[PDB]
Design an enzyme around this catalytic site. Structure first.
Site, PDB file in Angstrom:
ATOM      1  N   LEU A 265      16.205  19.288  15.361  1.00  7.58           N
ATOM      2  CA  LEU A 265      15.614  18.106  15.974  1.00  7.58           C
ATOM      3  C   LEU A 265      16.597  17.353  16.866  1.00  7.58           C
ATOM      4  O   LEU A 265      16.277  17.046  18.019  1.00  7.58           O
ATOM      5  CB  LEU A 265      15.066  17.174  14.889  1.00  7.58           C
ATOM      6  CG  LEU A 265      14.137  17.818  13.862  1.00  7.58           C
ATOM      7  CD1 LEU A 265      13.701  16.798  12.821  1.00  7.58           C
ATOM      8  CD2 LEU A 265      12.930  18.437  14.549  1.00  7.58           C
ATOM      9  N   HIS A 266      17.788  17.043  16.356  1.00  9.74           N
ATOM     10  CA  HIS A 266      18.733  16.239  17.116  1.00  9.74           C
ATOM     11  C   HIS A 266      20.136  16.430  16.559  1.00  9.74           C
ATOM     12  O   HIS A 266      20.315  16.784  15.390  1.00  9.74           O
ATOM     13  CB  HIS A 266      18.355  14.753  17.089  1.00  9.74           C
TER      14      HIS A 266
ATOM     15  N   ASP B  32      18.086  -2.532  13.498  1.00  6.27           N
ATOM     16  CA  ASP B  32      17.831  -1.611  14.596  1.00  6.27           C
ATOM     17  C   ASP B  32      16.339  -1.477  14.888  1.00  6.27           C
ATOM     18  O   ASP B  32      15.872  -0.390  15.246  1.00  6.27           O
ATOM     19  CB  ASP B  32      18.431  -0.238  14.274  1.00  6.27           C
ATOM     20  CG  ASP B  32      18.881   0.513  15.507  1.00  6.27           C
ATOM     21  OD1 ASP B  32      19.209  -0.136  16.521  1.00  6.27           O
ATOM     22  OD2 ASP B  32      18.911   1.763  15.454  1.00  6.27           O
TER      23      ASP B  32
ATOM     24  N   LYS C 126      19.577  15.838   7.171  1.00  2.00           N
ATOM     25  CA  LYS C 126      20.680  15.301   7.951  1.00  2.00           C
ATOM     26  C   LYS C 126      21.986  15.776   7.332  1.00  2.00           C
ATOM     27  O   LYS C 126      22.139  15.765   6.106  1.00  2.00           O
ATOM     28  CB  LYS C 126      20.647  13.773   7.998  1.00  2.00           C
ATOM     29  CG  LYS C 126      19.360  13.200   8.556  1.00  2.00           C
ATOM     30  CD  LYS C 126      19.539  11.752   8.976  1.00  2.00           C
ATOM     31  CE  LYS C 126      18.208  11.126   9.352  1.00  2.00           C
ATOM     32  NZ  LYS C 126      18.329   9.661   9.580  1.00  2.00           N
TER      33      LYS C 126
ATOM     34  N   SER D 207      24.131  14.385  17.212  1.00  7.24           N
ATOM     35  CA  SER D 207      24.861  13.320  17.887  1.00  7.24           C
ATOM     36  C   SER D 207      26.037  12.844  17.042  1.00  7.24           C
ATOM     37  O   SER D 207      25.863  12.503  15.867  1.00  7.24           O
ATOM     38  CB  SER D 207      23.928  12.147  18.199  1.00  7.24           C
ATOM     39  OG  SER D 207      24.328  11.482  19.383  1.00  7.24           O
TER      40      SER D 207
ATOM     41  N   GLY E 200      28.837  14.297  15.694  1.00  7.60           N
ATOM     42  CA  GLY E 200      29.113  15.062  14.496  1.00  7.60           C
ATOM     43  C   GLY E 200      28.003  15.093  13.471  1.00  7.60           C
ATOM     44  O   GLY E 200      28.215  15.606  12.368  1.00  7.60           O
ATOM     45  N   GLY E 201      26.826  14.562  13.793  1.00  8.11           N
ATOM     46  CA  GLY E 201      25.723  14.557  12.854  1.00  8.11           C
ATOM     47  C   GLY E 201      24.454  15.154  13.425  1.00  8.11           C
ATOM     48  O   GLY E 201      24.048  14.814  14.540  1.00  8.11           O
ATOM     49  N   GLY E 202      23.815  16.045  12.669  1.00 12.09           N
ATOM     50  CA  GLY E 202      22.590  16.681  13.113  1.00 12.09           C
ATOM     51  C   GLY E 202      21.402  16.388  12.219  1.00 12.09           C
ATOM     52  O   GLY E 202      21.569  16.041  11.047  1.00 12.09           O
ATOM     53  N   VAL E 203      20.194  16.518  12.762  1.00  8.94           N
ATOM     54  CA  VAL E 203      18.964  16.259  12.024  1.00  8.94           C
ATOM     55  C   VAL E 203      18.064  17.475  12.168  1.00  8.94           C
ATOM     56  O   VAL E 203      17.772  17.906  13.289  1.00  8.94           O
ATOM     57  CB  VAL E 203      18.247  14.991  12.526  1.00  8.94           C
ATOM     58  CG1 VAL E 203      16.907  14.819  11.824  1.00  8.94           C
ATOM     59  CG2 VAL E 203      19.130  13.769  12.318  1.00  8.94           C
TER      60      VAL E 203
END
Ligand SMILES: Nc1ncnc2c1ncn2[C@@H]1O[C@H](CO)[C@H](O)[C@H]1O
Ligand SMILES: Nc1ncnc2c1ncn2[C@@H]1O[C@H](CO)[C@H](O)[C@H]1O
Lengths: 246, 242
Positions: free
Chosen positions: A10-11, A142, A33, A13, A15-18
């Protein structure tokens, strides 16, 4: 060795992915995640793993709230952290501004009244959810269209909780909203009170005017929306009151 | 003013990415905006700072096929806008859920079509990265989420915020190695991309880089990938391990 089949990227950014996955033991849909550490400088900020654990902590504070994704699982392989969350079905609110906005120059007031009722549902649901989050001692920091899920039954949900913080903390840091400049000097629940007011106008403004008009025009924007949508008029008045309290 | 925003694509770190159309020529454009003080990071950079930096990198790379052109940039008050060309095509990560899961007792013709496709895409990513290094900047975020596969199967890169001059990290599949610098950072990412195009998603995320040679062995057992291709990847990924 995992009991999770990862089926979609999915994404990614910082150093972190989903990822979207499947519990193979039950077939249940889940979101994964994951984060990897980064040994670096203080000016680099918190790394992906530090921000992943804060989000898990916040989601654990908010457990049992309808509209907050549950934490199903968490583990580490080496220093690779994995966070398994329930998948909120539905569409993010920002994808409604593509088609459901061009309410064309001269449209059918049947669809206009239907949309106004719809938008007020969404804001009311988001506000109830935010209220329940404040009752746990947490301030979402947020709130905007990209974080709001609209489920098939029209109920709402919030996706990313990495920015939430305990309410007791007093932090002058204000995150900006896609539509209006970040308000100077606000903390506690007031930060979400501001984002909610911004959302009350954004739900009715077209995308181009959303990005272009600044917060000094809020009063004009409220009055303009009132002439084109059957909104109870003090509702929009109170949003502009909140956005321009400085 | 001369643009009509049609869709809200993303918002992160105080910066919004929107799809639009030039109202004059009717062309498809991408709108990025930033307000001052928004997205203030630990290093003092806000969203305007990052947007200014992305424009700078895109300007140094002007004319390169695969780098989006800078169409426009202006301010409205303190509000900064950056207008980029819209890359047509699909992001490489959307194939990893559609193209290569069905290739599990698979059809050898489709296995071969995908293999030739992946080697073409990776080779095009190599040439793009080479032209970028020649201009003196190092991409730093090379992975499947940043690569666009255009209709004609040529490639492009999408986000240049992380780019930086060669003078002065983690990958979706593997940890970044300690102390790599210059263009060598990009070649590690290209090595990871070689195995990533041929591994299932769960094995990608779960297996660490100590197992690179093993994954290269596993790939050659399902795909007609030339072995030197896989061994150059495994060697580059483990070049600083025991
Ligand atoms: N816990 C969750 N449930 C469902 N979707 C999630 C999710 N976490 C992230 N997403 C997806 O990320 C994108 C927005 O950041 C997508 O808009 C959003 O679908
Ligand atoms: N110039 C461009 N052409 C096509 N898509 C663009 C784009 N610039 C950004 N995107 C899309 O925005 C998201 C994050 O920037 C996505 O990563 C990315 O798909």
């Amino acid at each position: 060795g995992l009991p999770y089949r990862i089926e979609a990227a999915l994404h990614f950014s910082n150093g972190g992915g989903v990822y979207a996955g499947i519990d193979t033991r039950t077939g249940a849909q889940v979101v994964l995640k994951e984060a990897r550490p980064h040994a670096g400088l203080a000016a680099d900020g918190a790394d992906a793993v530090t921000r992943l654990r804060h989000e898990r902590d916040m989601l654990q504070r908010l457990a049992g709230i309808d509209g907050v994704p549950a934490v199903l699982d968490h583990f580490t392989l080496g220093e690779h952290h994995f966070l398994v969350l329930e998948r909120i079905e539905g569409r993010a609110l920002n994808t409604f501004f593509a088609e459901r906005h061009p309410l064309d120059p001269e449209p059918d007031p049947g669809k206009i009244a239907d949309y106004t009722a719809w938008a007020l549902r969404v804001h009311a649901g988001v506000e109830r959810l935010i209220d329940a989050i404040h009752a746990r001692g947490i301030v979402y920091n947020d709130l905007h269209m990209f974080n709001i899920m609209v489920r098939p039954d029209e109920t709402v949900a919030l996706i990313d909780f990495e920015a939430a913080a305990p309410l007791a903390e007093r932090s002058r840091q204000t995150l900006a909203n896609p539509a209006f400049q970040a308000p100077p000097g606000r903390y506690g629940a007031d930060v979400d009170r501001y984002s909610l007011a911004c959302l009350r106008l954004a739900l009715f403004l077209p995308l181009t005017t959303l990005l272009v008009q600044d917060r000094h025009k809020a009063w004009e924007l409220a009055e303009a929306i009132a002439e084109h949508f059957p909104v109870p008029r003090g509702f929009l008045r109170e949003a502009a009151r909140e956005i321009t309290r400085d």
